[PDB]
Amino acid sequence: QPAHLCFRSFVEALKVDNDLVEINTPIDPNLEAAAITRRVCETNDKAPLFNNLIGMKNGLFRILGAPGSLRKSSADRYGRLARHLALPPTASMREILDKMLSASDMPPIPPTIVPTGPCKENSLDDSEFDLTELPVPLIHKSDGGKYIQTYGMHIVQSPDGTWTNWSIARAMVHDKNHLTGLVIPPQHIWQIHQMWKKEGRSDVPWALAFGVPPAAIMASSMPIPDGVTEAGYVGAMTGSSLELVKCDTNDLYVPATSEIVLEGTLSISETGPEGPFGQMHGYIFPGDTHLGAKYKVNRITYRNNAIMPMSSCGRLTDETHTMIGSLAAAEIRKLCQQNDLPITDAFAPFESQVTWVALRVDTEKLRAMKTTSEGFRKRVGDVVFNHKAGYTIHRLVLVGDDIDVYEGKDVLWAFSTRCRPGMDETLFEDVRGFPLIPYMGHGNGPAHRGGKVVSDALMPTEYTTGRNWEAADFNQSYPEDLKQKVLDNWTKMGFSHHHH
Amino acid sequence: QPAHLCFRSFVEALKVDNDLVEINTPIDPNLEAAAITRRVCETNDKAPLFNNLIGMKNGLFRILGAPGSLRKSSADRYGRLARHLALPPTASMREILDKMLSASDMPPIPPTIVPTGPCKENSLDDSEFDLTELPVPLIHKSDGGKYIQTYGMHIVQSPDGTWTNWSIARAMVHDKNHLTGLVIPPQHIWQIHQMWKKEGRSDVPWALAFGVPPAAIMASSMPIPDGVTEAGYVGAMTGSSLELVKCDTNDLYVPATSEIVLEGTLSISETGPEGPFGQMHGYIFPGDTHLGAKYKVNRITYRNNAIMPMSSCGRLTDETHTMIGSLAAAEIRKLCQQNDLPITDAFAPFESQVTWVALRVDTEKLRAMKTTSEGFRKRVGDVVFNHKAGYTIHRLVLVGDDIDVYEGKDVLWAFSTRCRPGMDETLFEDVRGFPLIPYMGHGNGPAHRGGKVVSDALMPTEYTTGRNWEAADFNQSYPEDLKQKVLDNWTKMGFSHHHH
Ligand SMILES: Cc1cc2c3c(c1C)C(C)(C)C[C@@H](O)N3c1c(nc(O)[nH]c1=O)N2C[C@H](O)[C@H](O)[C@H](O)COP(=O)(O)O
Ligand SMILES: Cc1cc2c3c(c1C)C(C)(C)C[C@@H](O)N3c1c(nc(O)[nH]c1=O)N2C[C@H](O)[C@H](O)[C@H](O)COP(=O)(O)O
Ligand SMILES: [K+]
Ligand SMILES: [K+]
Ligand SMILES: [K+]
Ligand SMILES: [K+]
Numbered sequence A, B: 001q002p003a004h005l006c007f008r009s010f011v012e013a014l015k016v017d018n019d020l021v022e023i024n025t026p027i028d029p030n031l032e033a034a035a036i037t038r039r040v041c042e043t044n045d046k047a048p049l050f051n052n053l054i055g056m057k058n059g060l061f062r063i064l065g066a067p068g069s070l071r072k073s074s075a076d077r078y079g080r081l082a083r084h085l086a087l088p089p090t091a092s093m094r095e096i097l098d099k100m101l102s103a104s105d106m107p108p109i110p111p112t113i114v115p116t117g118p119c120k121e122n123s124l125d126d127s128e129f130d131l132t133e134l135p136v137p138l139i140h141k142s143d144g145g146k147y148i149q150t151y152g153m154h155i156v157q158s159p160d161g162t163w164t165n166w167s168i169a170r171a172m173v174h175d176k177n178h179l180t181g182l183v184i185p186p187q188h189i190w191q192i193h194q195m196w197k198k199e200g201r202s203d204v205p206w207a208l209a210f211g212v213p214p215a216a217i218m219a220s221s222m223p224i225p226d227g228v229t230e231a232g233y234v235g236a237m238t239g240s241s242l243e244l245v246k247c248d249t250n251d252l253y254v255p256a257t258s259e260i261v262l263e264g265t266l267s268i269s270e271t272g273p274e275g276p277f278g279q280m281h282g283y284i285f286p287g288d289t290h291l292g293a294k295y296k297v298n299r300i301t302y303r304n305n306a307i308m309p310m311s312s313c314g315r316l317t318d319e320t321h322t323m324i325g326s327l328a329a330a331e332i333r334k335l336c337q338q339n340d341l342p343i344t345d346a347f348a349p350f351e352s353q354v355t356w357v358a359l360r361v362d363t364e365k366l367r368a369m370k371t372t373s374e375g376f377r378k379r380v381g382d383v384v385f386n387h388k389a390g391y392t393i394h395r396l397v398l399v400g401d402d403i404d405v406y407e408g409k410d411v412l413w414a415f416s417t418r419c420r421p422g423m424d425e426t427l428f429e430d431v432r433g434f435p436l437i438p439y440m441g442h443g444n445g446p447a448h449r450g451g452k453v454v455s456d457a458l459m460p461t462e463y464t465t466g467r468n469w470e471a472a473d474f475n476q477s478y479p480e481d482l483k484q485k486v487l488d489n490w491t492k493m494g495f496s497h498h499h500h
């Protein structure tokens, strides 16, 4: 099976790419696996495959860390991401985001039901598993539980059967047969939970699939629109219908090659302690436990020699930056274009801990609008911050055509030099805030409202007659024939490879 | 003579450090020298010494580019700066800034007058030079003139003789015997010019010395207090009295080993076209010529085989970032401590294009003040933004004890995650602004007022009971014995030098 359609094939692809280290000696799931993974993420090293987990029993489980993290070289920086999508490993960020947006103007390709697949190779009923006995990792030293769920896909369906959502949301082991996790607005798992709660008749049929098709975990991490079934979007994106098999104890459908599948229910009434968790902005507040949603597990099915993917998230750079930030940015690009705003490109700079999105403006288009910074800031911020795709993002930075939004150094340059503090910004206090950001949920103001800003790093003439500066840099402040002469004589004179 | 006391010795020190490239083939001062220098600055390469300048006549002149720029390795990153001050080349930023502040609580060491020195080896009178015939560089393609003055020291004295100031301010050739340049408030050259203008009797006696003692050019770049003679400050800092020789045509005194000396007058009445210039924020606005101050040159004296230092300034990283930003930060640290604020460290992040200063707070001290973010922001901003040492700085970022302000990644992390936009900031509109920043002088609001902000990246409990988080990073989220185990097994497992 292809790497983008089968997680086991994806692991082999990373091996073959010399982007994997197989660790075959015993590693403790209590902190050690995650500490190695954290080190990998902080240094852009090879992904670790832990083949010998202390406490693995009857095939459950190996761990792959850092599945969507960065590579060290510039040339294949995003190569792990590319391998989720059948793209060349030297793909740029723009190419990866365009692949994830491509299905937005295509008919869905609904999934294909097959009678079995590798995820049915083994099963454990209600009397045969205990989630507290599996080698679930403790990811950070102060975490409030063992976070089994950092890179699986929650599967829930609307009561009327018309929408089946696939998403990533964290969950931890509560007891032998229950998890607790985050289910918060405006996320689709929460929106669907609310529909079940309003109907009031039963708990939500649920499945959690780990080691799913890499293209499916990417869509799981992307804010595609309300009511759109991720399976059909991924089918469109990849050009192929995804093969799904029915759960044994409910009527949901899971990827046939899922490594591990939990089947059960998401309660419409019960809660349980959840968190704290070391999270995407780089923090853990020890002892900050709150009540989260509660899931009951009725059945586990799994592949022979099952592998659980794990994100050891926190400070730069891991899946919470490369996937959450970038895929929100992509959806924000599209949303702005659909609202007739002249946005060409969007990216969440890693240096902002993916709390900012830089929006590259087609300033020829802007000039024809004959508008002003105040008006334009307001319009952009009303579109993005009143939509779900803006949820996680607290600062939008508008930049002109000379800035590459995929390069955080240039975004930082433009923000620092072109946006006058106060005057060139509009604050938004009556929008949904992201409470996970420390300055929200642990800050001075309301955890769930406000704290957002549009910062205009367009210069005045970009609205009127055109750019009226040149950069004071080697590229822009010297003529071409001089530049080339300097480059050609560089090593001759005494001064000091693209792949490496 | 020691490197920190003699520019010629400094050049030799860079050679010996393998931090120089001597270019002995012909290089054009029209753009080529500066383009090589710009490339060096953008890549942290070795400093270029142009020994064969097209148009050099009778010893005037060789050029040394990038005299205070960065080195490529992390271990001796600031080594060129260290060599201005007799510090080891592996000196940290904190050590360099502490050396520049050290004379602030020492008695001055006034200079020593000697009868001659190397700067008198050659001279040209009123009938023998023409500034338009010297190999003055064109630094950027759209510059409004040939900027002879990017790394010399202007020397002016108060009318009453009590204060002699040394400072860097840009100047360009106007004609055969005049320069034009920036002389703007609140800078000391402007403050002294105003005193002469108020007296109204004559033009200001002036000298411009190039290739001065490296320790003197550093103090020239630092906002030491009003009325304090830089020579005596440098004498205190270095522990030695600086040797000065009298000018031939006025009664000012220049460093005895200056490479090149211009003697004349700064007009109290005349102006002339000046700029545009590719400047420290990375921009040039072509055609933006304004009237600047006018200097008359009566005499040139110079060393045999004179070398003119040159800053090819613009985008990161050059002397305008490493010296202007850092030395302002140092003075701001001191100013805050003198006003009883609990600041331990200050640095202008390069990523902000040196428009921000991050202030590290001793949060034990802060807690004992029993204050609030609003009050504390206000107090810090009133102290810094109403002083000259805050002139260039438009954003102050307050951070707690866990942030290393010398590491821009950590400053960016804390600003992005701990400061709520709007709520955690105070805008200052009734302070002096820095008009050179594009969003000031070419922006939407008054070029000379406002546009400043204090951004509080202290968390709420840092004012009350103490830090209540741990970072979700390898250092803070794993116990010590685990960390060391991981590091010790790193290469054994399969994963991947301080000097490199
Ligand atoms: C890639 C990725 C995404 C997320 C998460 C993680 C990773 C690795 C964790 C490591 C598990 C950390 C956790 O904070 N986490 C997470 C989460 N969204 C939540 O509601 N709850 C969460 O606990 N997202 C983001 C969501 O996946 C996206 O916002 C997506 O858009 C949701 O899908 P949908 O509602 O649009 O269908
Ligand atoms: C290191 C350095 C400092 C400065 C400059 C440059 C370099 C390399 C130029 C490349 C020439 C660019 C120019 O923008 N420039 C410059 C300038 N200050 C100005 O009033 N005018 C200027 O044109 N400073 C800053 C000043 O040197 C300091 O602010 C110092 O504090 C002044 O001394 P004082 O008034 O405190 O005595
Ligand atoms: K999704
Ligand atoms: K602006
Ligand atoms: K000075
Ligand atoms: K704050």
Ligand SMILES: [Mn+2]
Binding pocket: A165, A166, A167, A188, A223, A224, A225, A228, A230
């Ligand atoms: Mn969805």
Ligand SMILES: [Mn+2]
Binding pocket: B165, B166, B167, B188, B223, B224, B225, B228, B230
């Ligand atoms: Mn001074």
